[PDB]
Amino acid sequence: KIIEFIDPTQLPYNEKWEFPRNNLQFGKTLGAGAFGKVVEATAFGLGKEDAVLKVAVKMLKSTAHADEKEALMSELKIMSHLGQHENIVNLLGACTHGGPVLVITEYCCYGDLLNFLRRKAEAMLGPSGRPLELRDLLHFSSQVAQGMAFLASKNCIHRDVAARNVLLTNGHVAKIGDFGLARDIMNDSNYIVRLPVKWMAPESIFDCVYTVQSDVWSYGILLWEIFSLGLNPYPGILVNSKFYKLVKDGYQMAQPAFAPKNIYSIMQACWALEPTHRPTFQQICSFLQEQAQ
Ligand SMILES: COc1ccc(COc2cnc(COc3nc(-c4cnn(C)c4)cnc3N)cc2OC)cc1
């Protein structure tokens, strides 16, 4: 979403991004949903620098039709309007003319943050590369906050902030984005009939209201994901009538194993029942950037 709400089909696709599709050489498939997939590829002569580099290319699986074609184009038009930041999955180019709609973006080698933390935790238990510590977890949260702070500054709402959507690139730089149609089949469970119920705020569940403050609620759950080393939110609890009453009546998860008091306290602030009383993304940055340094 973009507040002004703006119809994404009405937004102009900028031809500056256009890239010759024959200058793309595809490799291994990184991910694939129901009607989308993300294959890695080498882009020859990209931008003013004409840099030969490896890029992630998202595209529709052949079994995807009119609604998907406009859906993917809507994501391209949003990424073009947003601009560029260190902590967001940046648009590098796209291919609209003479074939299917392709969307070229930065390539983050370590993958998504949820799978990263789960693999790294198992690596640290191995003994009984380079082990994770508290400063790393505080760093990731600090970067994801900066990206969301940049998104909010352009009057843009994410509607699905999560560790699955956060990508880690070279030198451990967390970039927030949205896989979208190139979802993981392993992540189909979290989307209840489809929306990510466990990450959404109450107003988004009941009133269907989506604001910058509702993304902060999700960022609170994203912190719980990070400082629990990739546990599922509300672990063991099933999504049903009983869950909705708990979330509305003000139920909160217990302090995760690796969360400092001040870090867990910030999650509770993000889980304020009143949307307006939650922390701004700018407030979360200045704090976490300090706790990092
Ligand atoms: C909120 O406004 C926005 C902002 C950014 C976006 C970008 O949307 C995306 C596009 N494309 C990808 C996928 O590309 C990549 N995939 C991998 C990958 C996957 N598995 N493995 C092993 C590696 C790594 N790096 C990649 N760049 C991921 C997006 O969001 C995360 C959409 C909406």
mmCIF file of N, CA and C in Angstrom, residues 119-132:
data_model
loop_
_atom_site.group_PDB
_atom_site.id
_atom_site.type_symbol
_atom_site.label_atom_id
_atom_site.label_comp_id
_atom_site.label_asym_id
_atom_site.label_seq_id
_atom_site.Cartn_x
_atom_site.Cartn_y
_atom_site.Cartn_z
ATOM 1 N N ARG A 119 19.741 -22.275 10.816
ATOM 2 C CA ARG A 119 20.950 -23.006 10.421
ATOM 3 C C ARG A 119 22.136 -22.657 11.320
ATOM 4 N N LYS A 120 22.265 -21.376 11.661
ATOM 5 C CA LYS A 120 23.411 -20.897 12.439
ATOM 6 C C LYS A 120 23.354 -21.410 13.878
ATOM 7 N N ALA A 121 22.148 -21.481 14.437
ATOM 8 C CA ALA A 121 21.945 -22.034 15.776
ATOM 9 C C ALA A 121 22.377 -23.498 15.840
ATOM 10 N N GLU A 122 22.015 -24.264 14.813
ATOM 11 C CA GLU A 122 22.403 -25.672 14.712
ATOM 12 C C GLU A 122 23.913 -25.830 14.529
ATOM 13 N N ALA A 123 24.529 -24.876 13.832
ATOM 14 C CA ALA A 123 25.981 -24.854 13.658
ATOM 15 C C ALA A 123 26.703 -24.598 14.983
ATOM 16 N N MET A 124 26.111 -23.755 15.827
ATOM 17 C CA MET A 124 26.679 -23.431 17.141
ATOM 18 C C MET A 124 26.527 -24.576 18.149
ATOM 19 N N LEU A 125 25.504 -25.410 17.964
ATOM 20 C CA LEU A 125 25.311 -26.605 18.793
ATOM 21 C C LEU A 125 26.135 -27.793 18.290
ATOM 22 N N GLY A 126 26.655 -27.683 17.067
ATOM 23 C CA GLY A 126 27.460 -28.732 16.437
ATOM 24 C C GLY A 126 28.526 -29.385 17.305
ATOM 25 N N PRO A 127 29.438 -28.577 17.885
ATOM 26 C CA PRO A 127 30.534 -29.085 18.718
ATOM 27 C C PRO A 127 30.120 -30.146 19.741
ATOM 28 N N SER A 128 29.043 -29.884 20.475
ATOM 29 C CA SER A 128 28.544 -30.820 21.480
ATOM 30 C C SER A 128 27.662 -31.883 20.833
ATOM 31 N N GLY A 129 31.775 -22.170 11.283
ATOM 32 C CA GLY A 129 32.338 -21.017 10.590
ATOM 33 C C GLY A 129 32.696 -19.893 11.543
ATOM 34 N N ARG A 130 31.691 -19.110 11.930
ATOM 35 C CA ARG A 130 31.882 -17.991 12.855
ATOM 36 C C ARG A 130 30.594 -17.774 13.659
ATOM 37 N N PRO A 131 30.608 -18.124 14.962
ATOM 38 C CA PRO A 131 29.376 -18.196 15.753
ATOM 39 C C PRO A 131 28.686 -16.846 15.961
ATOM 40 N N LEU A 132 27.354 -16.856 15.973
ATOM 41 C CA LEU A 132 26.568 -15.641 16.193
ATOM 42 C C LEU A 132 26.627 -15.203 17.653
#
